[PDB]
Amino acid sequence: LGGPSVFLFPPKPKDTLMISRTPEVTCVVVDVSHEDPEVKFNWYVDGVEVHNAKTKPREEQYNSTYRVVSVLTVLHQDWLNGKEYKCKVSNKALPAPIEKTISKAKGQPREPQVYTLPPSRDELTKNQVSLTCLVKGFYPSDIAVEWESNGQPENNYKTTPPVLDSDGSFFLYSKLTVDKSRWQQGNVFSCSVMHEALHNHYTQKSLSLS
Amino acid sequence: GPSVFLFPPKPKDTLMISRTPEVTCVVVDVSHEDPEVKFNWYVDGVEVHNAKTKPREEQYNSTYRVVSVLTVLHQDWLNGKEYKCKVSNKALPAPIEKTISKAKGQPREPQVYTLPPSRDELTKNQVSLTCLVKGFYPSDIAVEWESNGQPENNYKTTPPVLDSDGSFFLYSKLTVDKSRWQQGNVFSCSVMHEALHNHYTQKSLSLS
Ligand SMILES: *[C@@H]1O[C@H](CO[C@@H]2O[C@@H](C)[C@@H](O)[C@@H](O)[C@@H]2O)[C@@H](O[C@@H]2O[C@H](CO)[C@@H](O[C@@H]3O[C@H](CO[C@H]4O[C@H](CO)[C@@H](O)[C@H](O)[C@@H]4O[C@@H]4O[C@H](CO)[C@@H](O[C@@H]5O[C@H](CO)[C@H](O)[C@H](O)[C@H]5O)[C@H](O)[C@H]4NC(C)=O)[C@@H](O)[C@H](O[C@H]4O[C@H](CO)[C@@H](O)[C@H](O)[C@@H]4O[C@@H]4O[C@H](CO)[C@@H](O)[C@H](O)[C@H]4NC(C)=O)[C@@H]3O)[C@H](O)[C@H]2NC(C)=O)[C@H](O)[C@H]1NC(C)=O
Numbered sequence: 177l178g179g180p181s182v183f184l185f186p187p188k189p190k191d192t193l194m195i196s197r198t199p200e201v202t203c204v205v206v207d208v209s210h211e212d213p214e215v216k217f218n219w220y221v222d223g224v225e226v227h228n229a230k231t232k233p234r235e236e237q238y239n240s241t242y243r244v245v246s247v248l249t250v251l252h253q254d255w256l257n258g259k260e261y262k263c264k265v266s267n268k269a270l271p272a273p274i275e276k277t278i279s280k281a282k283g284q285p286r287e288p289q290v291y292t293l294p295p296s297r298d299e300l301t302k303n304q305v306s307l308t309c310l311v312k313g314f315y316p317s318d319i320a321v322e323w324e325s326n327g328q329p330e331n332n333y334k335t336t337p338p339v340l341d342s343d344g345s346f347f348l349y350s351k352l353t354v355d356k357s358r359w360q361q362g363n364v365f366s367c368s369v370m371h372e373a374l375h376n377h378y379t380q381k382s383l384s385l386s
Numbered sequence: 387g388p389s390v391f392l393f394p395p396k397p398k399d400t401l402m403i404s405r406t407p408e409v410t411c412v413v414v415d416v417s418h419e420d421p422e423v424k425f426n427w428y429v430d431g432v433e434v435h436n437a438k439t440k441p442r443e444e445q446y447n448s449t450y451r452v453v454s455v456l457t458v459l460h461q462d463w464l465n466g467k468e469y470k471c472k473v474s475n476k477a478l479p480a481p482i483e484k485t486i487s488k489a490k491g492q493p494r495e496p497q498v499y500t501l502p503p504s505r506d507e508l509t510k511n512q513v514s515l516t517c518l519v520k521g522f523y524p525s526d527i528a529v530e531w532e533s534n535g536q537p538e539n540n541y542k543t544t545p546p547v548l549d550s551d552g553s554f555f556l557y558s559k560l561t562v563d564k565s566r567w568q569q570g571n572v573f574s575c576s577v578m579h580e581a582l583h584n585h586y587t588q589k590s591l592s593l594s
């Protein structure tokens with residue numbers, strides 16, 4: 177016992193922002209029983225049925241239920257224009273098909289402002305210091321943030337989740353931890369942001385000892 | 387059917403004697419057919435019965451959200467005692483146990499750093515005052531802002547984030563009219579955490 181359940185996952189924020197990448201919506205059905213293992217997917221874009229999804233064969237799990245995945249490739253401009261993607265899942269153990277819908281959050285997009293903040297005077301008594309990137313005033317909350325210096329990725333960073341601000345836009349901070357020496361030697365560090373409301377879906381802000 | 391969820395105290399409440407920390411047992415999706423709920427509470431095994439149940443708010447789906455509330459001792463929670471909630475029903479095949487306690491591990495003191503607005507931002511009507519709090523453990527923490535002894539309220543604080551060393555960090559953003567910052571007012575980020583001496587510290591921020 178335990179009827180099937182459906183989870184619908186959006187594309188990754190970077191994937192809709194760059195045409196070289198492949199944005200996808202993923203419809204996952206879990207807890208499919210052995211007695212009723214047949215699963216049917218119907219896909220709709222703004223209520224209109226589409227037939228180009230790629231559905232995988234069911235995969236039995238170690239708890240003896242089946243998991244079935246259907247992947248719908250989306251056009252970047254369709255996602256950014258706010259189309260609604262509906263996954264309809266039909267199983268003979270279900271009273272009625274299960275429907276899940278996903279889209280970009282509704283609202284007018286807002287351009288992020290990106291500000292770099294150097295380490296506090298207090299922190300420069302430690303061996304590692306904190307380079308901060310503040311990204312505020314953006315909408316919707318889908319965004320990507322990265323760090324680099326001299327063209328190469330800096331991996332020792334963490335980014336807060338987006339946070340709803342009091343004007344209804346979002347903000348976040350990204351913290352990059354570097355060895356104090358590197359900051360003191362005047363290296364330039366770069367915070368880069370990918371968001372739909374930026375020109376070319378991209379901006380960069382630099383930060384160095386001055 | 388009914389679902390049962392247990393919630394911990396607010397961090398501020400466990401850190402100040404004058405505040406009242408509580409654990410909270412909430413029950414969703416309870417029907418009129420079967421809307422009668424019971425509660426038992428236990429603390430580190432040793433049962434207690436100084437709890438208190440509340441009014442079963444009916445919700446917009448013919449279900450009755452029910453809630454019990456157990457008051458807890460500050461140092462019991464900070465010493466890691468477990469708090470178990472058992473809700474006996476009759477539409478229940480069996481009773482449902484649910485337990486909660488403070489995150490395990492050596493507490494670590496937050497470092498607090500204030501950062502002033504970026505130069506680029508100073509062309510706006512309002513500016514962002516930043517408070518970085520890092521290196522703390524557990525993630526239970528409270529952050530406030532004030533100026534001239536009075537609370538600043540137009541601020542937002544990120545959730546704690548797991549850092550690479552296993553400690554947590556967060557950021558708090560206070561937004562002020564740029565004129566206030568230009569005048570030279572002093573703004574204060576205050577941080578409450580169990581690993582702080584007297585559970586409290588302040589860092590101040592002014593135009594300099
Ligand atoms: C039997 O086993 C199965 C299988 O489990 C496996 O086998 C067993 C035996 C064990 O070994 C087990 O450890 C194994 O994992 C069990 O199946 C599980 O069933 C549960 C439900 O019971 C599912 O729980 C939901 O998980 C969601 C998150 O799933 C992702 O994250 C977890 C890790 O955190 C992964 O394990 C998952 O696979 C998912 O991973 C995501 O997968 C996507 C699809 O591939 C990825 O997206 C794609 O990725 C590519 C790559 O880049 C491209 O980018 C594509 O473009 C992109 O589409 C995605 O990146 C990937 N992420 C990660 C991190 O890996 C939760 O979302 C979900 O929560 C919702 O539902 C809850 C109610 O059930 C609710 O409480 C939650 O709040 C939430 O509700 C939603 O909330 C959000 C906001 O918070 C709202 O937006 C929604 O509206 C709201 N919906 C509501 C309210 O309805 C669940 O927690 C679990 O995922 C599933 N596992 C697997 C592997 O599928 C099964 O339970 C067992 N049965 C029994 C009886 O025991």
Ligand SMILES: *[C@@H]1O[C@H](CO[C@@H]2O[C@@H](C)[C@@H](O)[C@@H](O)[C@@H]2O)[C@@H](O[C@@H]2O[C@H](CO)[C@@H](O[C@@H]3O[C@H](CO[C@H]4O[C@H](CO)[C@@H](O)[C@H](O)[C@@H]4O[C@@H]4O[C@H](CO)[C@@H](O[C@@H]5O[C@H](CO)[C@H](O)[C@H](O)[C@H]5O)[C@H](O)[C@H]4NC(C)=O)[C@@H](O)[C@H](O[C@H]4O[C@H](CO)[C@@H](O)[C@H](O)[C@@H]4O[C@@H]4O[C@H](CO)[C@@H](O)[C@H](O)[C@H]4NC(C)=O)[C@@H]3O)[C@H](O)[C@H]2NC(C)=O)[C@H](O)[C@H]1NC(C)=O
Pocket residue numbers: 389391393394395396399407408409410412414415445446447449451
């Ligand atoms: C019928 O309606 C009801 C009511 O909803 C309302 O009515 C409908 C009609 C709509 O109008 C709707 O919009 C309305 O909201 C529906 O009710 C919901 O039912 C779901 C269950 O299906 C419940 O979802 C769980 O939520 C838990 C968190 O709840 C808090 O947060 C939400 C917001 O996110 C609030 O809505 C809640 O009220 C809770 O808010 C917290 O409340 C506490 C109690 O008061 C507060 O603490 C106290 O506060 C006081 C004063 O404020 C003192 O300070 C005390 O000191 C303090 O203790 C607290 O502050 C407050 N916080 C916030 C932020 O508001 C989730 O915990 C839970 O998730 C777990 O379980 C999931 C299973 O679904 C699982 O998927 C999750 O991943 C997660 O699993 C856990 O994971 C962690 C690790 O991450 C592990 O530790 C656990 O082991 C693991 N547990 C597992 C796996 O089991 C659920 O998501 C929801 O509570 C409830 N809504 C309400 C409002 O109560 C109902 O669904 C409808 N029915 C139908 C059939 O449609």
